[PDB]
Amino acid sequence: ARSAYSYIRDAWENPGDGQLAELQWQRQQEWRNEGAVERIERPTRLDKARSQGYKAKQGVIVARVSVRKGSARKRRHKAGRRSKRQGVTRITRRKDIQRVAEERASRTFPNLRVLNSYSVGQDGRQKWHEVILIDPNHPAIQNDDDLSWICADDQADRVFRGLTGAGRRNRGLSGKGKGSEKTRPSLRSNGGKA
Amino acid sequence: GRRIQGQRRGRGTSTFRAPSHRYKADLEHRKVEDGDVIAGTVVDIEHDPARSAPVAAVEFEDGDRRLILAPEGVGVGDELQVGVSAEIAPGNTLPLAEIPEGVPVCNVESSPGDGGKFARASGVNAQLLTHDRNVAVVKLPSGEMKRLDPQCRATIGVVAGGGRTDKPFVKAGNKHHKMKARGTKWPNVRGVAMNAVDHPFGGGGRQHPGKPKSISRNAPPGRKVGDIASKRTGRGG
Amino acid sequence: GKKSKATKKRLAKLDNQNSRVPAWVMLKTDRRNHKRRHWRRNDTDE
Amino acid sequence: PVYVDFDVPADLEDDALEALEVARDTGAVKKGTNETTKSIERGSAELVFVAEDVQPEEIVMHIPELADEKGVPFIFVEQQDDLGHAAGLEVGSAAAAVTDAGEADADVEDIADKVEELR
RNA sequence: GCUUUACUGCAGGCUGUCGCUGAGGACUCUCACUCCGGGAGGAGGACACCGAUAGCCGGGCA
RNA sequence: ACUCGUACGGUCACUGAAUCCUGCCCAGUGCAGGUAUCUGAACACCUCGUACAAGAGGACGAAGGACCUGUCAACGGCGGG
RNA sequence: GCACGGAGGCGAAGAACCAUGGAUUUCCGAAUGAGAAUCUCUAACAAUUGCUUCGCGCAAUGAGGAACCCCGAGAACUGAAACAUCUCAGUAUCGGGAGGAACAGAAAACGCAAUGUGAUGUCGUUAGUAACCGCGAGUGAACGCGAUACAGCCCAAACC
Ligand SMILES: [Cl-]
Ligand SMILES: [Cl-]
Ligand SMILES: [Cl-]
Ligand SMILES: [K+]
Ligand SMILES: [Mg+2]
Ligand SMILES: [Mg+2]
Ligand SMILES: [Mg+2]
Ligand SMILES: [Mg+2]
Ligand SMILES: [Mg+2]
Ligand SMILES: [Mg+2]
Ligand SMILES: [Mg+2]
Ligand SMILES: [Mg+2]
Ligand SMILES: [Mg+2]
Ligand SMILES: [Mg+2]
Ligand SMILES: [Mg+2]
Ligand SMILES: [Mg+2]
Ligand SMILES: [Mg+2]
Ligand SMILES: [Mg+2]
Ligand SMILES: [Mg+2]
Ligand SMILES: [Mg+2]
Ligand SMILES: [Mg+2]
Ligand SMILES: [Mg+2]
Ligand code: NA
Ligand code: NA
Ligand code: NA
Ligand code: NA
Ligand code: NA
Ligand code: NA
Ligand code: NA
Ligand code: NA
Ligand code: NA
Ligand code: NA
Ligand code: NA
Ligand SMILES: [Sr+2]
Ligand SMILES: [Sr+2]
Ligand SMILES: [Sr+2]
Ligand SMILES: [Sr+2]
Ligand SMILES: [Sr+2]
Ligand SMILES: [Sr+2]
Ligand SMILES: [Sr+2]
Ligand SMILES: [Sr+2]
Ligand SMILES: [Sr+2]
Ligand SMILES: [Sr+2]
């Protein structure tokens, strides 16, 4: 039969309809009053977190992060530029907001490593994402068959090197064939043209 | 070119800041619970560096010693009241609602409880004209009819120091001393007297603005100089 | 000026270094303090 | 609160929890929102409880309407930990379901009846 | 380096539109949101602010 | 920042103590206000087109402009016959 | 010791010397009790975190490293015989971060279209080809093939 989870999932397909609509309207009022990174006891979208790797266990942390909405907050050129490099208003950054959120979360919890993240809405001036972070030093995790991989040295600060699911997608690594000529194995090795 | 003086201002560097560390106090109305059971005694009259007008030090019943924006005619010993039931006497503060139409007031609040925003300069006063259950109409010093929440508090009387403007400075040195008590860069070099790189009006053999002075409201900073969005100029017509 | 305890330790070290290469080092090496300094001609750090 | 559409009197909640406790000793009961959900879906449920202090609310938002289109009666409990204690758990429980009472069928019936009346 | 009704652009301002954003070609309301208030509460209000885009101005700047 | 400031204020400009004075010009340019009619973008809407889409046209029309007015201690002008 | 002196001493109680392991290891320094131009003042994981016995009790982070590597920010001189798209170039330089290598990686692939190939780097080639471009100057792949090395697995959910 359908899992209880499928119901949370199905609710979030139309965050603007039904009970979820009213919940969000209520919640955001409180979220707007909270900081940039608020640790939370439980995921807001359980089905999504469990799907991404979350477990109700010691060493697993969840945090909600908000970021200002919109394009780049770029400073206009003070020195000479050809028309082409004078733009300031329509230029957007290359990292999506979800990625900016994962990094702020990870900076708040220096000892934890980002596992994944998902969206929990936005209003007219900001976006919220919840981020799952793991304590690579806690034995409950070092002994987990599904999460111990994140304890390896080379997984340190993984989010800052684009090793996140959101990181990999933003780097154009989704497709395995056409269109990924300059994204795989890395943007850098391809001269930064992807 | 280079940023004009008006643009250096916004950065709030020392040259443009007011000598705040020398200013005395924020003459905002006292905050009363209700009832008007607040009275104090004028304990002293002082000079206010920030406004070139006198201020009065009041000692309130509950033990609070605060400087007050004093109207004309207030002296040591006099008792002042602040509250809804305060007596309609010069120097007392109360909401416009409690004030009789046709009475000059000063230090009028813009929004109830803000402490006062209008008519605070030397010898000026607002004039309460109309009352109502929803709107108190006041005539401000500029002569404009302002609609205010009748819950906006004011002080009865005109501000102390009237006529300060009647006497000329006579000397640059006198202007100087006053300017040193304000957030202003003085003296003033004319735009026409500067190099083209420094102002829209600079440059040219003889001095003259090589352009009309009435500038559009939409003009960007650095260009908005001269007569800003003038509806008209001159004395004629 | 006024010297701190540390400054004084550093100044003292500079004074000590400012000495001759012992005569015996000459013989032993069979034939110059390249760091000889003068208070006037030179300038120390700080 | 968004999924709650009527308040239950402390007394009623009292009787319900007790009925639930004797249900696990005698009959059969499901502990957990997931198990509770499948029971309501498989139709093997007589009475389902739903805590009211559940945060986030999405975990249980579906129980009410799901129960209606399945005839299954349901009742609210002010606290999550009581439901878990009553359900015989050393932890809390956002929802519970009596999968066939046990020498409590009589009580369960009345509670359901009382609830319907309570709208 | 400087100028301007030189060429081409870029900030910035004004203006419409979409999102924020709700209920009953002009209108009422309150619940988001804004402001005042120590607080209760008051003022305002789906506007404004902010994100996006479109038209006009634009030697302020390249 | 101005600002512990509130029009007897402070911002932006011009002229440059006192004294006697400061004429004519609003066509151009600038600013500002108004504006029946005209013109005036995008989204939404309508027609054609496409099993859809590109696209073509339409209706509506904000600021702006056309047009009218105000203004020279506003840029400036006050000739030849 | 360099270091070719003088004096004196150590070494058969096997010194010197070399290898491995251990001891000692002032102060400043990430610098961490507070402060300071390497010192001072009155018990210290400062600060941010995780677990928590809710007590700094147990732990993590911080800074360094020649370049290499990953993720972000991103010029201009220059070329086009001027110059704006283009070029120089995702170069210089900047912010963040890991390792001994990084990154990638077990198909919602390929599309020598097939009765065919079968994770991913990389090397040779495909090729200055296709594609881009004031269609100017210039920019510029991929599939495949030959090699190198080869390796495939784990969750979420259903049912418990
Ligand atoms: Cl991380
Ligand atoms: Cl003055
Ligand atoms: Cl093939
Ligand atoms: K160039
Ligand atoms: Mg398993
Ligand atoms: Mg004050
Ligand atoms: Mg000064
Ligand atoms: Mg002057
Ligand atoms: Mg000059
Ligand atoms: Mg200029
Ligand atoms: Mg002149
Ligand atoms: Mg000596
Ligand atoms: Mg405020
Ligand atoms: Mg120029
Ligand atoms: Mg002059
Ligand atoms: Mg002069
Ligand atoms: Mg220290
Ligand atoms: Mg050239
Ligand atoms: Mg590589
Ligand atoms: Mg050419
Ligand atoms: Mg290229
Ligand atoms: Mg290919
Ligand atoms: Na971290
Ligand atoms: Na010296
Ligand atoms: Na020059
Ligand atoms: Na004219
Ligand atoms: Na050592
Ligand atoms: Na530590
Ligand atoms: Na502790
Ligand atoms: Na050339
Ligand atoms: Na040239
Ligand atoms: Na080109
Ligand atoms: Na072949
Ligand atoms: Sr680190
Ligand atoms: Sr004030
Ligand atoms: Sr105040
Ligand atoms: Sr000039
Ligand atoms: Sr005149
Ligand atoms: Sr000297
Ligand atoms: Sr619990
Ligand atoms: Sr004169
Ligand atoms: Sr005119
Ligand atoms: Sr293989």
Read off the amino acid at residue B89: A
The residue assigned the tokens 């596992």 is A115
Q: Is the CB atom of residue A85 positioned under 7 angstroms from any atom of strand E?
A: no
A114 burial type by CB count under 10 A (0-12 exposed, 13-18 middle, 19+ buried) = buried
Q: Say if residues D40 and D70 touch (Cβ distance below 8 Å).
A: yes
CATH number of the domain that residue D38 is part of: 3.30.1330.30
Do residues C3 and C11 lie in contact, with contact meaning Cβ atoms separated by under 8 Å? yes
Q: Which helix (H) or strand (E) holds A120?
A: strand A113-123
Backbone phi and psi for residue B97, each to the nearest 5 degrees, phi listed first: -45, -45
Counting every residue written for chain D, the total comes to 119
Resolution in angstroms, to 1 decimal, for this deposition? 2.2
Q: Prior bond to B71 cis, omega within 30?
A: no
Which of D58, D65, D70 to substitute to test the interface with A, most A CBs within 10 Å?
Answer: D58
Method: X-ray
Q: Report the topology of domain C1-46.
A: Atp Synthase Epsilon Chain; Chain: I; (1.10.1620)
What are the structure tokens assigned to D29, written together?
A: 């009961």
Residue B4 Cβ < 7 Å to strand F? yes
Taking the C-alpha atoms of residue A179 and residue A145, their distance in angstroms, rounded to an integer, is 35
Is B110 within 8 Å of B196 (Cβ atoms)?
Answer: no
Cβ atoms within 10 Å of D113's Cβ, excluding its own: 11
CB A54 within 8 A of CB A62: yes
Q: How far apart are CA D95 and CA B96, in angstroms?
A: 59
Distance, C-alpha B85 to centroid of its chain: 28
Q: Under CATH, domain B160-237 is a member of which superfamily?
A: Ribosomal protein L2, domain 3 (4.10.950.10)
Find the A78 Cα to ligand 4 centroid distance in Å: 16
Element (H, E) at D39: helix D33-42
| Closest D-chain CA to A42 | D56
Give, as ranges, the nucleotides of chain E with any atom within 7 Å of a protein CB. Answer: 1-4, 8-14, 19-21, 32-33, 35-43, 49-53, 57-62
Whole-number Å distance between alpha carbons of A134 and A112: 5
- Sketch the domain layout of chain C as residue ranges: 1-46
Strand G within 7 A of A43 CB: no
Q: Which residue has the tokens 């609210």?
A: D76
Locate B29 and state its tokens: 């109305």
How many angstroms separate the CA of D77 from the C1' of G59?
40
> A1-194 — its CATH code?
3.40.1120.10
Which residues contact residue A73 at a Cβ distance below 8 angstroms, ignoring those fewer than 6 apart? none
- Asked if residues D74 and D48 have their Cβ atoms less than 8 Å apart, the reply is yes
User: In whole angstroms, what is the distance from residue B5 CA to residue C40 CA?
Assistant: 48
Distance CA B127, CA D32 (A): 72
Task: Give the integer Cα–Cα distance in Å for B198 and B5.
Answer: 8
Distance A25 CA to E46 C1' (A): 15
Nearest CA in chain D to A15: D58
Give residue D78's Cα distance to chain centre: 11
Classify burial at B231, counting beta carbons within 10 Å of its beta carbon; exposed 0-12, middle 13-18, buried 19 or more.
Answer: exposed
Question: B158 near B130, Cβ under 8 Å?
Answer: no
Strands B53-60 and B39-48 turn out to be antiparallel
Give dist(CA B158, CA B125) in Å, integer: 5
The CATH class given to the B82-159 domain equals mainly beta
- The superfamily CATH assigns to domain B1-78 is Nucleic acid-binding proteins (2.40.50.140)
**Sequence spans of domains, chain A:** 1-194
What are the respective helix, strand and coil percentages of chain C, to the nearest 5? 40, 0, 60
Cα–Cα dist B128/B151, whole Å: 13
Question: Could you give the number of structural domains in chain D?
Answer: 1
Tokens standing for residue B102? 């046709």
Q: What is the CA radius of gyration of chain C?
A: 14
Among B62, B69, B9, B21, smallest CA distance to B40 is for B62
Phi, psi of D22 (to 5 degrees): -75, -10
- Closest C-alpha among A74, A78, A117 to residue A94: A74
